[PDB]
DNA sequence: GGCTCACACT
DNA sequence: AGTGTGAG
């Protein structure tokens, strides 16, 4: 309960969608490159950006036309379009390539299309018994940064010189004859993550970064400290200095309104300033669960488990119809429900063959023009047959009384979003 | 900005 | 069963 019981890693692919396209098209490699969807509006919306393009200021959610003003040589790859919508199939398949490799090492929790947490606690005990008392060379950690090192009293004017000196200070001081030390466990964790990152790159051509620490939140934070193509070890001891200047919003789950209340109500900026408040005081402001979570977390302690889940629990297809393009006829709503239902059907049949399960509930969601909320409305029905016409007709049946227009041909208010989601999966 | 996913709350 | 937050 100093939050040092587990070794947890978070592995995240570098500029993932870009790398998928660069692997396929060698002309894009080692260049300023972005991935875009819907090429016809302002050149497309950027969804992923190479490190070479980031150095010109190009970011996610820029329009390509705009990104081209910062980087005129920027190269683009377009997301596949099918039935009038962006289709992410090539990136989900590439994801499967990566997840299957990691799952050879340990139990993973698929956290996104491009990252997974790894509980390495057992793999570490077993690796610590294999090298009996035998030390750990820097050569086993060729890409690892030890966060908060080097410290104290040429080389270190270069990034690779600092990395090494810190690693050397860390290793020089490790107590290897003691198999229970949390720091030693982390070190062996990092060795394993080197091997995992090497296998990923060898087997896929994709580079990634990772964090190694005692829990998910720290592992995720660590990962991003030395992107791209590097891994970062955040020990329990590094936490006070690390947290002392770490904006609250950088910690996973605190990037939104909760994080903002924490800052506003308590009158603080940094994760470390949370240590001054009693658990009861945090619970008073933020509730029993969040207050307890904050109190532990600001001291580097979190217990959320790496869940044994490699598969998504829901399979969704959605499309926005912004501004003037909002859907305004019954016929038009039906046609799009059908396009969504067809893609979903293909994805479900594949899921059923691959993963030996079937979805049993269909969720329909919409947004009406005028609504401020991402969803105006969710309704659900039975999913008894992977049949796109049935699924489309059922989703229409379920929403059609949201229609204010008595003309019945027309649809009001116009719809700015449709979403179909298969959920409540059972084995078969 | 657009297409996804997970989960807490009621 | 339905809504809202947070992430990637
Ligand atoms: N808002 C977002 C964030 C991510 N994505 C997709 C595209 C990203 O390549 C992929 C993984 O997201 P990410 O890990 O947050 N960023 P990415 O892998 O591109 O770069 P780094 O992790 O190297 O920064 O999810 C998206 O489509 N919309
Ligand atoms: Mg990534
Ligand atoms: Mg990611």
In the structure encoding, which two tokens stand for residue A136, read together? 């750990």
State the structure-solving technique.
X-ray
Q: What is the DSSP secondary structure assignment for residue A79, as one 8-state letter?
A: P
Which residues, 6+ apart, have CB-to-CB distance to A45 below 8 Å? Answer: A36, A37, A38, A61, A62, A63, A64
First to last CA, chain A: 41
What is the rounded radius of gyration, in angstroms, for the C-alpha atoms of chain A?
25
- A108 CB neighbour count, 10 Å cutoff: 25
Q: Are A47 and A259 in contact (CB under 8 A)?
A: no
- In chain A, how many H helices and how many E strands? 14, 16
Report the distance separating Cα A49 and Cα A61, nearest Å: 10
Q: Domain-by-domain residue ranges, chain A? A: 1-14+85-247, 15-84, 248-305, 306-428
Phi, psi of A133 (to 5 degrees): 50, 10
* Nearest ligand to residue A51 Cα: 1
Burial track A150-169 (b if 16+ CB lie within 10 A, e otherwise): beeeeeeeeeeeebbbbbee
Distance A361 CA to C2 C1' (A): 14
What is the per-residue burial (b if ≥16 Cβ within 10 Å, else e) of A110-127?
Answer: bbebbbbbbbbbebbeeb
Q: Which CATH class is domain A248-305?
A: mainly alpha
- Hey, whose CA ends up nearest to atom 24 of ligand 1? A15
**A296: CA distance to ligand 2 center in Å?**
27
- Which protein residues touch ligand 1 with a CB less than 6 Å away? A 12-17, 47-48, 60, 113-114, 227-228
A293 touches strand B (CB under 7 A): no
Query: Which atom belonging to ligand 1 lies closest to the Cα atom of A51?
Result: 23
Contact A362, A345 (CB under 8 A): no
Q: Tell me the angle at which helices A182-204 and A121-130 cross, rounded to the nearest 10 degrees.
A: 100
Q: Tell whether omega for the bond before A413 is within 30 degrees of 0, i.e. cis.
A: yes
Enter the tokens of residue A71.
């980087």
Span from the CA of A122 to the centroid of ligand 2 (angstroms): 26
Distances (CA, A) of A304 to A64, A107, A215: 39, 15, 8
Which residue puts its alpha carbon closest to atom 27 of ligand 1? Answer: A47
Q: Which two tokens stand for residue A207?
A: 């580079």
Closest CA to A16 of A190, A306, A229: A229
Q: Does domain A15-84 have CATH number 3.30.300.130?
A: no
A42 backbone φψ class: left, alpha, beta (φ>0; ψ -120 to 50): left
Own/partner pairs, A373-376, CB within 8 angstroms, 24+ separation: A374/A417, A375/A417, A375/A419, A376/A402, A376/A417
Q: Tell me the fold of A306-428.
A: Dna Ligase; domain 1 (3.30.1490)
Nucleotides of chain B within 7 Å of a protein C-beta? 1-9
- A306 by Cβ neighbours in 10 Å (0-12 / 13-18 / 19+) ranks as buried
User: What is the whole-number distance in angstroms between the Cα of residue A171 and the centre of ligand 3?
Assistant: 30
Is domain A1-14+85-247 classified as CATH 1.10.10.10? no
User: Which residues touch A171 (CB under 8 Å, ≥6 apart)?
Assistant: A135, A136, A137, A138, A141, A187
Resolution (A): 2.0
Peptide bond before residue A215 is cis, with ω within 30 degrees of 0: no
């Amino acid at each position: 309960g100093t939050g040092q019981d587990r070794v947890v890693a978070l592995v995240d692919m570098d500029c993932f969608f870009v790398q998928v396209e660069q692997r396929q098209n060698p002309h894009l490699r080692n260049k300023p490159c972005a991935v875009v969807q819907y090429k016809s509006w302002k050149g497309g919306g950027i969804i992923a950006v190479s490190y070479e393009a980031r150095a010109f200021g190009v970011t996610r959610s820029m329009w390509a036309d705009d990104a081209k003003k910062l980087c005129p040589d920027l190269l683009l790859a377009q997301v596949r379009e099918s039935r009038g919508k962006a289709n992410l199939t090539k990136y989900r398949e590439a994801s499967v390539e990566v997840m299957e490799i990691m799952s050879r090492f340990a139990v993973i929790e698929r956290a996104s299309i491009d990252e997974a947490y790894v509980d390495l606690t057992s793999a570490v005990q077993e690796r610590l018994q294999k090298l009996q008392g035998q030390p750990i060379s820097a050569d086993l950690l060729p890409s690892t940064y030890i966060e908060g090192l080097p410290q104290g009293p040429e080389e270190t004017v270069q990034k690779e010189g600092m990395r090494k000196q810190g690693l050397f200070q860390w290793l020089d001081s490790l107590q290897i004859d003691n198999l229970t030390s949390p720091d030693l466990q982390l070190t062996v964790g990092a060795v394993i993550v080197e091997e995992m990152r090497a296998a990923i790159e060898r087997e896929t051509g994709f580079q990634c970064s990772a964090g190694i620490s005692h829990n998910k939140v720290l592992a995720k934070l660590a990962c991003g400290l030395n992107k791209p193509n590097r891994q970062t070890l955040v020990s329990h001891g590094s936490v006070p200095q690390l947290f002392s200047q770490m904006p609250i919003r950088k910690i996973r789950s605190l990037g939104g309104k909760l994080g903002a209340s924490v800052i506003e109500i308590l009158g603080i900026e940094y994760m470390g300033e949370l240590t001054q408040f009693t658990e009861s005081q945090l619970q008073s402001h933020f509730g029993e669960k969040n207050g307890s979570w904050l109190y532990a977390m600001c001291r580097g302690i979190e217990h959320d488990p790496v869940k044994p889940r490699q598969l998504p629990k829901t399979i969704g297809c959605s499309k926005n119809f912004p501004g003037k393009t909002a859907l305004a006829t019954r016929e038009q709503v039906q046609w799009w429900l059908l396009q969504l239902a067809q893609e979903l059907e293909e994805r479900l049949t594949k899921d059923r063959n691959d993963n030996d399960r079937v979805a049993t509930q269909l969720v329909v969601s919409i947004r009406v023009q005028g609504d401020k909320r991402l969803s105006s409305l969710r309704r659900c029905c039975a999913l008894t047959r992977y049949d796109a016409h049935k699924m489309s007709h059922d989703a229409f049946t379920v929403i059609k009384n949201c229609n204010t227009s008595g003309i019945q041909t027309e649809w009001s208010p116009p719809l700015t979003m449709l979403f179909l989601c298969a959920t409540k999966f059972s084995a078969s």
